[PDB]
């Protein structure tokens, strides 16, 4: 438990290309500047070392990546952001004392205008119902920012503990997100009700949006 613990801030940084990015990494106790390293990580790709030793750039690291620190607080700075620089960034203590622990990571996100999601709902299929289960899907298409609230209501009653959510990466085209929420019940629990509704709260919506259906319609 002698381990140094690193903590990064912010959890998510939302900026545009060409802007200045600054990421903070705070150590629980003072670490020598010679043992603080930064890494870049993109999903599906291996992590790449950026800053190491005494704020020295690694191989093939452009000059827009710089590093500073005081022993307890360290900072990775990107002067101007190229599109290829939006990713995850980690800090690590390496060389001081094992284990060589990391930070929780900071995500760099593209900041665009506010976009409201398109809300769609899909009822269960006969194929799934013949197996004893019913899944209702609610899709939020192309929205920004990523903060969105999806609630399931069955006969005007809020559900809890029987739904799952999933969000896509930021789109390389319009820089939006998409969310899929799946509510799953048994065939009995499903057929014991009538109205199934998906309620969506988002910054781009003045009032929440409800997409509902009657089980008797389908």
């Amino acid at each position: 438990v002698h381990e140094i613990v690193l903590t990064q801030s912010p959890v998510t940084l939302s900026l545009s290309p060409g802007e200045r990015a600054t990421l903070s990494c705070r150590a629980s106790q003072s670490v020598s500047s010679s043992y603080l390293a930064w890494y870049q990580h993109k999903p599906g790709q291996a992590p790449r070392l950026l800053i190491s030793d005494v704020y020295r750039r690694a191989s093939g690291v452009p000059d827009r990546f710089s590093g500073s620190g005081s022993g307890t607080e360290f900072t990775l700075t990107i002067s101007r952001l190229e599109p290829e620089d939006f990713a995850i960034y980690y800090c690590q203590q390496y060389g001081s004392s094992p284990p060589y622990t990391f930070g929780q990571g900071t995500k760099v996100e593209i900041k665009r205008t506010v976009a409201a999601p398109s809300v769609f709902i899909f009822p269960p299929s006969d194929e799934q119902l013949k197996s004893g289960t019913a899944s209702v899907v609610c899709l939020l298409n192309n929205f920004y920012p990523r903060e969105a609230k999806v609630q399931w209501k069955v006969d005007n009653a809020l559900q809890s503990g029987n739904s799952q959510e999933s969000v896509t990466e930021q789109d390389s085209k319009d820089s939006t997100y998409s969310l899929s929420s799946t509510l799953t019940l048994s065939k009995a629990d499903y057929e014991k009700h009538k109205v199934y509704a998906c309620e969506v709260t988002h910054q781009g919506l003045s009032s929440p949006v409800t997409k509902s259906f009657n089980r008797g319609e389908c």
């Binding site: 190491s52 899909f122 299929s125």
Partner: protein, 242 residues
């Protein structure tokens, strides 16, 4: 140019022994000639891992001479070997449980106090990484997915545009690939990251937005591929009224 490559994949039941290997290219481990740069004894061949909802974890390291150093959280179950006859090094993790699922990387850490001429950039860090080996520990058996049609209806239509999709449910393990119309449909497709249910099986969705008027003209098929179970399923998503 020094590269690392990781071969294989991990599919284990709880209590079994994980074994992963890493191969080095662009440098020798049996080369005891120090005439420039850092000594090859300053290289520490490292295993790191990351679980989907967690931070990177330094598993451990072994050097050219055989000296190992292990994270105390794993040190009781972890063994690390190296051999210069193949320029490879391997990790053995006993008593694996569900908590050990994740991506396992091999890397090269560098810790040098002395050098001949120039200290190459990347000291005091992990300067070369492998691409990552996927490892899944679970009691579940390999199971191909059930593909159900998220049928388009009036409740999935907005301004001449209709959403339709495929629910790829109850499969194990990751991953699955999803294409539409045998790859001939790519615009406006969103395939969501799989979510692990409490049953130990994965589920995800793949949706696409098409013209509404085309729903009577075009036939839409989703092609789901699950390699671990050796399954391919072509499901036709037919419209519906609700």
């Amino acid at each position: 140019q020094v590269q690392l490559q990781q071969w294989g994949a991990g599919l284990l039941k709880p209590s079994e022994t994980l074994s992963v290997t890493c191969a080095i290219y662009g440098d020798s481990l049996s080369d005891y000639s120090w005439k420039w740069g850092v000594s090859r004894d300053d290289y520490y061949w490292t295993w790191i891992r990351q679980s989907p909802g967690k931070r990177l974890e330094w598993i451990g390291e072994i050097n050219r001479g055989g000296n190992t150093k292990y994270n105390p959280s794993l040190s009781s179950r972890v063994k690390m070997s190296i051999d210069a006859s193949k320029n490879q090094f391997s990790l053995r993790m006993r008593s694996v449980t569900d908590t050990d699922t994740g991506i396992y990387y091999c890397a090269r850490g560098r810790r040098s106090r002395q050098w001949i001429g120039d200290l190459p950039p990347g000291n005091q860090g992990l300067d070369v990484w492998g691409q990552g080996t996927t490892v899944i520990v679970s009691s579940a058996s390999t199971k191909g997915p059930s593909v159900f049609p998220l049928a388009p209806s009036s409740k999935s239509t907005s301004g001449g545009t209709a959403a339709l999709g495929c629910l790829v449910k109850d499969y194990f393990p990751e991953p699955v690939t999803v294409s539409w119309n045998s790859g001939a449909l790519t615009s406006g497709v969103h395939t969501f990251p799989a979510v692990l249910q409490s049953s130990g099986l994965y589920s995800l969705s793949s949706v696409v937005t098409v013209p509404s008027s085309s729903l009577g003209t075009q036939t839409y098929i989703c092609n789901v591929n699950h390699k671990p179970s050796n399954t391919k399923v072509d499901k036709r998503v037919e419209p519906k009224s609700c």
